[PDB]
Amino acid sequence: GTRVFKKASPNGKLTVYLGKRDFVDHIDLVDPVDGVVLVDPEYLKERRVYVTLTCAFRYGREDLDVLGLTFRKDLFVANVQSFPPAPEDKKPLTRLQERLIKKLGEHAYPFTFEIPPNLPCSVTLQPGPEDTGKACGVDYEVKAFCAENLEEKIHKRNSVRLVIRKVQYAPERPGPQPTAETTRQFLMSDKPLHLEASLDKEIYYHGEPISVNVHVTNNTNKTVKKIKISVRQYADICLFNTAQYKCPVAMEEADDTVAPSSTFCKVYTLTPFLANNREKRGLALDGKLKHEDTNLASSTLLREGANREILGIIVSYKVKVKLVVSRGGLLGDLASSDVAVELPFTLMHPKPKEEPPHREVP
Amino acid sequence: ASDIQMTQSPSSLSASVGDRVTITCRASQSVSSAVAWYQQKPGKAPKLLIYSASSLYSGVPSRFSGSRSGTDFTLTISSLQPEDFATYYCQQYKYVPVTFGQGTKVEIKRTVAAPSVFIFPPSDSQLKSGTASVVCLLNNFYPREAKVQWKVDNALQSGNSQESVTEQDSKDSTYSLSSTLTLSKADYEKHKVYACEVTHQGLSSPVTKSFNRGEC
Amino acid sequence: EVQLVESGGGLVQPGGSLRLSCAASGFNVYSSSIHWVRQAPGKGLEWVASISSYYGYTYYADSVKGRFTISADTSKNTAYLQMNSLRAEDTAVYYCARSRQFWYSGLDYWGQGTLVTVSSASTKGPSVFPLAPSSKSTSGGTAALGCLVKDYFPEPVTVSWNSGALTSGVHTFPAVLQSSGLYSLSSVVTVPSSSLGTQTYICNVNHKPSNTKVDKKVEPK
Amino acid sequence: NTDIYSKVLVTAVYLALFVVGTVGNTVTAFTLARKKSLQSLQSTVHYHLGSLALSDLLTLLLAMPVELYNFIWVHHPWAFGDAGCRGYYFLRDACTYATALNVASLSVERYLAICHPFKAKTLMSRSRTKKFISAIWLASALLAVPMLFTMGEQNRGGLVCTPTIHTATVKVVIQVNTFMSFIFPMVVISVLNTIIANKLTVMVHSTFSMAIEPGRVQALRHGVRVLRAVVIAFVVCWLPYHVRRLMFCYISDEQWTPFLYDFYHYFYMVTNALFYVSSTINPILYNLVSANFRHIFLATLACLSNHTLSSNA
Amino acid sequence: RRPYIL
Ligand SMILES: COc1ccccc1C1CCN(c2nc(C3(F)CC3)nc3ccc(N(C)CCO)cc23)CC1
């Protein structure tokens, strides 16, 4: 729309204008972060106005007596000098910038950041029930400050900070249908236990049910006593060392029995939501602006080939269909050999035509 | 935000086919653009017209348009069709006590018609039952803005009378009035003079009909 | 076909309880939010309660905070509004409405609405009182004749003149709620004075909820 | 052939070691097993830690109660028969093999994870870690089953629990047992831990970083010091045990005196206490090295600017 | 005598 966001410095001498707060990360290029900064040349006194775009990873440290204290690790930093224009090294003006400059007058100066591809999106890690502080995760932020030089102590009264979000939306073209199959032969079996699971679609929306078609062909002499089907969120997190995490966001344990020399076929419906997953500390949620409720983190879309090992948080989802089989011959039947398959799927928001904020707040 | 008040300035509006209809809504506090407009026909559920104060909902004709200026919002109907005569509500959905306006009723307009007044005395069965409800029936009158004054037995009656109003006819597009004057078994016999005065603006001068006990 | 079906409305006493059902069809309870909006007779829209079911939150108006309780049945895809300690001010037509859970909060789908009536009165049949035309007092070109319906509490009573034969512009009026708690409506019609003493006009008053049908005739004196 | 005071002191220190090791290893196993949401998929050190803790706990439980009754108090009647005299020795040797192999496997893991992390990401998985743990336990059992054939009961009261086979085979079975239980674990642990300590120093008390939780890191305190102290303790807590087991059979039918008899009967208790110390040392190192582990272990032990506005351009 | 205990 034609609306813009403005935020002023504590002293009121500096203010920043942005036409958006969520910037869409298409797989090839991101939306430019173009804005307008309004200065007071009679107050600067030969100073300069610097606007900085920072992608930072916020993390906590558990080896501390103080609780609720977090750090920041910068992943990407960009700088532009605004009040004194660069010697013809200035980006072309977008239409919103033209309107903002003509509206604000002569003391309004533009800034534009080009976020490089393969950078992490805004992901917020869910704080625990007992956690008083700033939530961990990756977020972007635009900061403008008056300073004589870049390497200087920034005063709080002369700077203004604005949190922005990098987001992705569901691809328009659906992918191939997710299909997984497996064949298991036990120790003293000599016969195969076949499991075939599939999803109805490759791309799902938040709050939308997922249908899992499970076809079991038991040609062995062991009994499948329980079928476990779950939706798992995978978080590839690279902060100081590469780490991978797994979290089930939706579960369905079915007491469905498959007899020896029998065939089974059922469809199971699951829907991941946040109301039953709020206790899971560290769960990946979509980027927040201040503290508002966000859905589960959308699937991170990476480049077509390779371009892996991102230093942020990579989110993906899988459906695991597990068959538990009553083992016999060497154990006391307490344990059970598990035959499982995994189905990867995409969980994202559809491409919108307006601002994501639902504007609902007490 | 304690509780946002949505004030629709036009409580009732009359317009003809093809005219431009403008309904405005004022918010007591800044609700950003989180404003929606709804159309409601008599006896039917409200239908969503626009949202985000400017966006048209799918299937809504291009005649309807929404616009935001400040804390105020405006709904405009261009080339008002006969299907667009209904009640319209502005709603803000920026705070969980979502609030609607008091509604704006859109009526049809034509030449002013003069009301016709009739007075019907209570029947013998009504008097025998124990309650008397003398009514004066007002026939077709376009402006819809009228009043009923009794002045029975040279004494004005107020605070008990109830009035009924029908909707516009599907072809005549004219209203009607029916007012009831409550009375007791002893009250009906005590006063032998009854009347019903009309303060309609359509007539140049007020029209008064008088009645007496025992008249046919 | 996206639709919402409401049920569970009807007569209550001032202090009783009701449960309303909204059978959602065509959408999920996790990608949609369910809201209840009531409309008092002659008044506008008033939001009552809402449920998100994705964030596990429920909201209520300040006037129904303790008495009303909203809940959803995810498996049946049905939301419920359990209303307790009902008052006379709770008499309204209750609609269940839907909104997108994500990135929208306007109500795009509405149910037909269930009328909820809360009063101490009980079902009662009507009592017709003839309205004799006053040819000595009515100046209309066509004589005006009417019938009076009084003291009927339940759903509006159908009134037909001469079993629907009359087509001279019969004007029925909406029933008003008297101080006692019972409704009353009047039906009038303009008839030419030529057939005043020849054509007999009978208003058929049939009240289905009370199963009381009374026939009356009006003739000028 | 021992004084009452020495026996009392040995019994007291053995009971203190029993309680300390059992409590520490049980709480360590609970800490490593008490998992929460968002389990890490590339961390396998906890599997080796739990395997080593279980090995130490089994050593404790299958060693102290049997030994204190008969060997500590130089009891002449062996309270069991031949099945017991074989099974207890088999279980003890299996426990020692499991402990040594668990420490060696922990050293191998840490190094793979530190020297070649990117290689170990694909070369090492949770399923492969479980396979390796099961393999080392099965190897411990298959190396200890010799003790079933070697041991037996004799008369020489009078129940004797001794290797009944000829000394020629005993001197080679003890030789291979000592080799595979000390020397190979000794070289593996020492070399790998020295390499790890050297690499930690060249790359740099809070020298390391570990992502215990998503977006939560912790520091590894006293890394190199503990990496060398584990080797020093394994040398101290094992070498006398194996030297005693070797000298029990590598001495001919000569140089036998009552002085040497009492010397063996006291060195037995001394070296067995040193052996048992290693079964308790590990959780102490776990606590002082990892802050998160120490916190969970102690918990289990105790429980046992302006505002953004809007406008239009 | 010999230790007799291993
Ligand atoms: C028994 O101790 C041995 C024996 C042989 C080889 C390595 C060890 C280490 C085991 C425990 N500790 C750790 N060392 C390292 C090294 F990286 C320095 C190699 N990483 C760890 C990571 C986690 C951890 N926990 C207690 C789990 C919970 O935090 C302990 C260690 C120090 C000695």
User: CB-based contacts of A58: which residues, under 8 Å, 6+ apart?
Assistant: A70, A71, A72, A73, A134, A135, A136, A137, A138, A139, D215
The residue whose two tokens read 């005569």 is: B85
- Assess whether A98 and A202 both reside in one domain: no
Give one DSSP letter per residue of chain D, joined into a string: ---HHHHHHHHHHHHHHHHHHHHHHHHHHHHHH---SSEESS--HHHHHHHHHHHHHHHHHHHHHHHIIIIITT-SS-SS-HHHHHHHHHHHHHHHHHHHHHHHHHHHHHHHHHHSHHHHHHH--HHHHHHHHHHHHHHHHHHHTHHHHHEEEE-----EEEE-S-HHHHHHHHHHHHIIIIIHHHHHHHHHHHHHHHHHHHH----EEEEEETTEEEEETTHHHHHHHHHHHHHHHHHHHHHHHHHTTSS-S-S--HHHHHHHHHHHHHHHHHHHHHHHHHHHHHHHHBHHHHHHHHHHHHH-----EEEE-
Could you give the CA distance from residue D273 to residue D13 in angstroms, rounded to a whole number? 8
Which segments of chain A are extended strands (E)? 3-8, 15-18, 22-24, 33-38, 48-61, 70-81, 108-113, 123-125, 137-147, 159-167, 179-184, 193-199, 203-204, 210-218, 224-238, 242-254, 262-270, 284-286, 313-326, 336-347
Give residue D100 CA to ligand 1 midpoint distance, Å. 15
- Assess whether A29 and A126 both reside in one domain: yes
* Distance (Å) from the alpha carbon of A314 to chain D's nearest alpha carbon: 12
For residue A353, what are the CA distances in angstroms to A356, A357, B56, C100?
9, 12, 12, 14
3-state secondary structure of C78: strand
Nearest atom within ligand 1 for CA of residue D110: 19
- Across the strands, what pairs with A145? A50, A159
Sign of the four-CA dihedral D195, D196, D199, D205:
negative
Hey, what amino acid is at D172?
A: V
Could you tell me the two tokens for C21?
């059902």
Domain boundary among A112, A142, A167: A167
A156 annotated to bind ligand: no
Per the CB < 8 A criterion, the answer to whether A118 and A307 are in contact is yes
Structural domains present in chain C: 3-118 (2.60.40.10), 127-218 (2.60.40.10)
Residue D106 Cβ < 6 Å to ligand 1: yes
CATH architecture of B6-107: Sandwich (2.60)
Could you tell me the two tokens for C7?
């049920």
Domain boundaries, chain D: 4-299
What dihedral do alpha carbons A82, A85, A88, A93 form, nearest 10°?
50
* Other C-beta atoms lying within 10 Å of the C-beta of residue D27: 22
* Distance (Å) from the alpha carbon of A172 to chain B's nearest alpha carbon: 20
Could you give the CA distance from residue D98 to residue D107 in angstroms, rounded to a whole number? 14
**Chain A within 8 Å of B30 (Cβ-Cβ)?**
no
* Domain D4-299, classified CATH 1.20.1070.10, yes or no: yes
Hey, what amino acid is at B158?
A: S
DSSP strand pairing (A33-38 vs A123-125): unpaired
- Kindly list the residues from chain D whose CB atom is less than 8 angstroms away from the CB atom of residue E2: 256, 261
Fold identical between B6-107 and B117-212?
yes
Per the CB < 8 A criterion, the answer to whether C138 and C144 are in contact is yes
Hey, what amino acid is at A148?
A: E
* Other C-beta atoms lying within 10 Å of the C-beta of residue B181: 19
N residues, chain B:
216
Residue B42 CB burial class (10 angstroms; 0-12, 13-18, ≥19): exposed
Q: Which of C82, C87, C90, C84 is nearest to C41 (CA)?
A: C90
Does residue A353 fall inside a structural domain? Answer: no
For residue B99, what is the enclosing H or E element? strand B99-100
Does residue A300 fall inside a structural domain? Answer: yes
Could you tell me the two tokens for A131?
């956690």
Could you give the CA distance from residue D114 to residue D44 in angstroms, rounded to a whole number? 13
Domain of residue A56 covers 5-167
Q: What is the helix, strand, coil percentage profile of chain E, to 5?
A: 0, 0, 100
Helices (H), strands (E): how many in chain C? 0, 19
Residue D281 Cβ < 6 Å to ligand 1: no
Query: Taking CA A317 as the corner, what is the angle to CA D129 and CA C75, rounded to the nearest 5 degrees?
Result: 120
Does residue A361 fall inside a structural domain? Answer: no
Q: Which of A3, A136, A156 is opposite residue D215, by nearest beta carbon?
A: A136
Could you tell me the two tokens for B135?
């009514």
Could you give the CA distance from residue B34 to residue C196 in angstroms, rounded to a whole number? 61
Q: Which of A354, A360, A362 is opposite residue B55, by nearest beta carbon?
A: A354
Q: Residue D92's Cα: distance from chain center in Å?
A: 12
Could you give the CA distance from residue D49 to residue D32 in angstroms, rounded to a whole number? 8
Written in H, E and C, the secondary structure of A208-231 is: CCEEEEEEEEECCCCCEEEEEEEE
CB environment C85-98: b (16+ within 10 A), e (fewer) = ebeeebbbbbbbbb
Identify how the structure was determined: cryo-EM
Hey, what amino acid is at D78?
A: W
CB environment B124-139: b (16+ within 10 A), e (fewer) = eebbeeebbbbbbbbb
Q: Which of D12, D21, D74, D7 is nearest to D276 (CA)?
A: D21
CB < 8 Å from C in window 108-167 of B: 116-123, 125-126, 129, 131, 133, 135, 137, 139, 162, 164-166
DSSP class of residue A265 equals: E
Per the CB < 8 A criterion, the answer to whether A273 and C54 are in contact is yes
At how many Å resolution was this determined? 2.7
Q: Which of C205, C177, C159, C134 is nearest to B136 (CA)?
A: C134
CATH T-level fold of B117-212:
Immunoglobulin-like (2.60.40)
Could you give the CA distance from residue D108 to residue D191 in angstroms, rounded to a whole number? 10
- Assess whether A105 and A187 both reside in one domain: no
DSSP strand pairing (A210-218 vs A262-270): antiparallel
Does residue A145 fall inside a structural domain? Answer: yes
Residue D190 Cβ < 6 Å to ligand 1: no
Sign of the four-CA dihedral D206, D209, D212, D215:
positive
Q: Helix D82-115 and helix D184-203: axis angle, to 10°? A: 30
Alpha helices, DSSP H, located in chain A: 41-44, 95-104
Per the CB < 8 A criterion, the answer to whether A57 and A133 are in contact is no
Please count the CA atoms within 13 angstroms of the CA of A211 that sit on its side-chain side. 6
Give the CA radius of gyration of chain E: 5
Which segments of chain C are extended strands (E)? 3-7, 11-12, 18-25, 32-39, 45-51, 58-60, 68-73, 78-83, 92-100, 109-110, 114-118, 127-131, 142-152, 158-161, 171-172, 176-177, 183-192, 201-207, 212-218
Per the CB < 8 A criterion, the answer to whether A227 and A325 are in contact is no
For residue B162, what is the enclosing H or E element? strand B162-165
Could you give the CA distance from residue B123 to residue C218 in angstroms, rounded to a whole number? 10
Residue of B nearest to A361 (CA): B95
Sign of the four-CA dihedral C161, C163, C168, C169:
positive
Residue A128 CB burial class (10 angstroms; 0-12, 13-18, ≥19): middle
Hey, what amino acid is at A353?
A: K
Could you give the CA distance from residue A232 to residue A341 in angstroms, rounded to a whole number? 13
Q: Which of D37, D124, D203, D289 to mutate to test the interface with A (most CBs of A within 10 A)?
A: D37
- Kindly list the residues from chain B whose CB atom is less than 8 angstroms away from the CB atom of residue A362: 95-97
State in Å, rounded, how far the first CA of chain A is from the last one.
25
- Assess whether A314 and A198 both reside in one domain: yes
Question: What is the domain-level CATH number for residue A37?
Answer: 2.60.40.840
Q: Do C56 and A352 touch (CB under 8 A)?
A: no
Domain boundaries, chain B: 6-107, 117-212
**Chain A within 8 Å of C47 (Cβ-Cβ)?**
no
Q: Which own/partner contact pairs does C1-4 have at CB distance under 8 Å and 24+ positions apart?
A: C1/C25, C1/C26, C2/C26, C2/C27, C2/C98, C2/C109, C3/C109, C3/C111, C4/C96, C4/C97, C4/C98, C4/C109, C4/C110, C4/C111
**Chain B within 8 Å of A360 (Cβ-Cβ)?**
yes
* Other C-beta atoms lying within 10 Å of the C-beta of residue D264: 18
Query: Taking CA A257 as the corner, what is the angle to CA A255 and CA A261, rounded to the nearest 5 degrees?
Result: 170
A134 annotated to bind ligand: no
Query: Taking CA C122 as the corner, what is the angle to CA C119 and CA C123, rounded to the nearest 5 degrees?
Result: 125
Written in H, E and C, the secondary structure of A56-76 is: EEEEEECCCCCCCCEEEEEEE
Give residue D286 CA to ligand 1 midpoint distance, Å. 7
Residue D21 Cβ < 6 Å to ligand 1: no
Could you give the CA distance from residue B96 to residue D65 in angstroms, rounded to a whole number? 69
Give residue A7 CA to ligand 1 midpoint distance, Å. 49
Could you give the CA distance from residue A337 to residue A358 in angstroms, rounded to a whole number? 47
Which residue puts its alpha carbon closest to atom 25 of ligand 1?
D290
Q: How many domains does chain A have?
A: 2
User: CB-based contacts of C215: which residues, under 8 Å, 6+ apart?
Assistant: C202, C203, C204, C205
Strand order in A3-8's β-sheet? A108-113, A33-38, A15-18, A3-8, D309-312
